Design a protein around this ligand. Structure first.
Ligand SMILES: Cc1coc2ccc(-c3cc(Nc4cnccc4S(C)(=O)=O)cc4nccnc34)cc12
Ligand SMILES: O=P(O)(O)OC[C@H]1O[C@](O)(CO)[C@@H](O)[C@@H]1O
Length: 430
């Protein structure tokens, strides 16, 4: 005896264990880059995840950074402070996982000693949390130097000292950790832990005892990402006939303005002067027509097809409000989770866009020509926007969104190609 829920259209009867991810490694080995990127992916696929960076606890507890002397192993007092910052971060990890509905807590510190990791194990074991270790190993001076230049010298620790002095201070800071650093030893003393040791910026991996699906998924993700420079371009199909009529969904062709956009996109792409640009479309006509103007090879993906409005397909928003007034209201109230009847939600979109994201990570220069709701979902991933926000991100017609991975984030530049269109943006209601 069953009833269908109003928002998600789920039939209900009418009368999982959380994980602490423990980063491991010397400073400037990309621990925080990984922490952030992973946390972005996990949240976007609907696994609530949060980073606890001990460094930030240390920054909060102590006046202002003066020098690497603070990190000296003989600094008996800084050691007490560091350890207390760690325990405070863990206190917050407990609260996040046990009481705030967090699923994954990423404990982002050096955690270079067996003793420290042993304390974290004990903390996890006694709260029924699983523990999963990720160690980044790299002994290439160039990579380290570049890491320091790119994100360290610019940190708030170093505002009073810049450049040569910061670079110099950071190298000595690193050397403070070298003597007591005990790498993960899966061969022997760590043979029973679940871990991945990543070597040389993802060149090789050593993976030991994957316990569950999240961990195998993390490993798969780590095996697909890369740090080569590249650019990702996202846009919609040129304006189509249904856009002109205010009609949603469907498989209409480009308007005359849509075709002018396509010519302009072609011009824009040529002027970007890229090598080996891959082009991806949906299987819907308007995106394919748009790519046809480019005179480049392209590949279609059913996963990039626009959200399926179900019974509302090909209707105007007005027609939907007149015909299905309660469905209309429910969508405006809960736009991410709402499923159209016999159709999709934004939540469903994320599931089928996941392999698009994973292939995007593998690629270099890519242009993705897609549809409004799909574009928002992808944009949310790259820009770390939440589920509640995703459905309202702005992605105008005839506008290219040019994304450039930077460390810890993504530059976004909008480039409108000066071809008029209607506006299909609909802001949050009531
Ligand atoms: C790819 C990949 C898969 O697993 C990884 C683990 C670490 C890193 C990583 C990423 C990384 N990125 C990074 C770190 N700090 C500042 C800038 C960057 S970057 C290269 O601009 O994105 C630097 C690293 N340095 C030493 C070892 N690993 C680094 C990359 C990968
Ligand atoms: O989630 P929203 O704001 O209704 O936008 C998705 C709609 O946008 C369009 O791509 C253009 O109106 C429709 O095909 C689709 O139903």
């Amino acid at each position: 005896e069953l009833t269908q829920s109003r928002v998600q259209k789920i039939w209900v009867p009418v009368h999982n264990s959380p994980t602490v991810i423990v980063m491991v490694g010397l400073p400037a080995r990309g621990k925080t880059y990984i922490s952030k990127k992973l946390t972005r992916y996990l949240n976007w696929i609907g696994v609530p995840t949060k980073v606890f960076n001990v460094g930030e606890y240390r920054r909060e507890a102590v006046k202002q950074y003066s020098s690497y002397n603070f990190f000296r192993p003989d600094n008996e007092e800084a050691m007490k402070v560091r350890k207390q910052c760690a325990l405070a971060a863990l206190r917050d990890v407990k609260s996040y996982l046990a009481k705030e509905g967090g699923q994954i807590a990423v404990f982002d510190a050096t955690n270079t000693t067996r003793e420290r990791r042993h304390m974290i194990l004990h903390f996890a074991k006694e709260n029924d949390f699983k523990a999963f270790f990720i160690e980044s190993v790299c002994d290439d001076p160039t990579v380290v130097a570049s890491n320091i230049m790119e994100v360290k010298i610019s940190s708030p620790d170093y505002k009073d000292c810049n450049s040569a002095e910061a670079m110099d201070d950071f190298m000595k800071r690193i050397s403070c950790y070298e003597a007591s650093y005990q790498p993960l030893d899966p061969d022997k003393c760590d043979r029973d832990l679940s871990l991945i040791k990543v070597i040389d910026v993802g060149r090789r991996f050593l993976v030991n005892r994957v316990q569950d699906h999240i961990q195998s998924r993390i490993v798969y993700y780590l095996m697909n990402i890369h740090v080569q420079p590249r650019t990702i371009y996202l846009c919609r199909h040129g304006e189509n006939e249904h856009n002109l009529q205010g009609r949603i969904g469907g498989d209409s062709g480009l308007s005359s303005r849509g075709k002018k956009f396509a010519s302009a996109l072609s011009k824009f792409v040529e002027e970007q002067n890229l090598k080996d640009l891959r082009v991806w479309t949906s299987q819907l006509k308007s995106t394919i027509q748009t790519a046809e103007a480019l005179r480049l090879p392209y590949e279609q993906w059913k996963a990039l097809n626009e959200i399926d409005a179900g019974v509302c397909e090909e209707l105007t928003y007005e027609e939907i409000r007149d015909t299905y007034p309660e469905e209309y209201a429910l969508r405006e109230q809960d736009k991410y989770y709402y499923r159209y009847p016999t159709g999709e939600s934004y939540q469903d979109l994320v599931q089928r866009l996941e392999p698009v994201i994973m292939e995007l990570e593998r690629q270099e220069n890519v242009l993705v020509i897609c549809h409004q709701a799909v574009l928002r979902c992808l944009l949310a991933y790259f820009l770390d926007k939440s589920a509640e926000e995703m459905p309202y991100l702005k992605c105008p017609l005839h506008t290219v969104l040019k994304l450039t991975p930077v460390a810890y984030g993504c530059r976004v530049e909008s480039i409108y190609l000066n071809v008029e269109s209607v506006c299909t943006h609909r802001e949050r209601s009531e």
